[PDB]
Design a protein around this nucleic acid. Structure first.
Length: 178
RNA sequence: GCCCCUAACCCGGCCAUAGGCGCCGGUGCUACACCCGGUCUCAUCAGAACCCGGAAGUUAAGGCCGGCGCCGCGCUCGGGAGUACUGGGCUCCGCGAGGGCCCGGGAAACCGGCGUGCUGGGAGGGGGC
């Protein structure tokens, strides 16, 4: 059950649906050392180097200025995504609300604290952290909207829909969708 | 080499008749793609992108072509209209602000109709010198 064989194939070879990428985010308020603990958690949780996310504006009521890092997110692809996604689903219990699916084939669910994930330990040093896990599904041909030269729009029939997203999570990932 | 003809590709000019939304078809030897990988050059949180090496799969998408509808847009077309406005003249009217006549120019909105990219160079392909 690896990334290359996790594919929902319909009656056309090029209309297959796969996990394009999985993005894990942690929104911490201000601190660097507080961020540093969250940055260390993501590196050891996912095995991938997380990137600091800087504030887009200066919000006085949150005590954040534009340009300082207030976020740590890492995007996961191919096999690191599938491996971590399986753990994340277990921490929730193979349950995802139906309303959590968007019309364009994105699924995001939250993790209130990271201990429910298998393979992690309650540590009084890192503390307790929440997580946002977003999964993107894509049919082949998404490069048409992302390449540098001759960028254009992908046809409507080649885009992942909400119904194809729920089916992928149920039929391929074996997840209870409610 | 040379001349002529000629799809999709490359470099352009004008920059919507070229744009936008929806629907229905065509195209795949080659060309364009989607596509397959990340040893090497290069790259990032991330081989997603960029870059490199390829050729199993596919015309589902992009590109290009044809048709229909609506919006937007365009037109040296009809009306609007010789209307609005206006250069020159006046012992012409009006209490007056202003109007009128003669000679010379002359719109716009809008309504209807038509249109919905045109074109330069090159590669490739065909024919001859």
């Amino acid at each position: 059950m690896k990334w290359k064989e996790l594919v929902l194939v319909k009656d056309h070879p090029m209309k297959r649906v796969y996990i394009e990428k999985v993005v894990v985010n942690i929104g911490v308020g201000t601190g660097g050392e507080r961020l540093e603990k969250a940055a260390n958690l993501l590196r050891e949780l996912t095995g991938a180097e997380p990137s600091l996310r800087r504030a887009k504006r200066s919000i006085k009521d949150f005590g954040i200025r534009k340009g300082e890092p207030i976020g740590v997110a890492v995007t996961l692809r191919r096999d690191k995504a599938v491996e971590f996604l399986m753990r994340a689903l277990q921490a929730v219990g193979n349950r995802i609300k139906r309303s959590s699916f968007d019309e364009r084939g994105n699924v995001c669910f939250g993790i209130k604290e990271h201990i429910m994930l298998p393979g992690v330990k309650y540590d009084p040093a890192v503390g307790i952290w929440g997580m946002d896990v977003c999964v993107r599904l894509a049919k082949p041909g998404l490069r048409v909207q992302l390449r540098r030269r001759r960028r254009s729009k992908v046809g409507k029939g080649q885009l992942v829909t909400r119904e194809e997203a729920v089916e992928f999570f149920q039929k391929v990932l074996g997840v209870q969708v409610d």
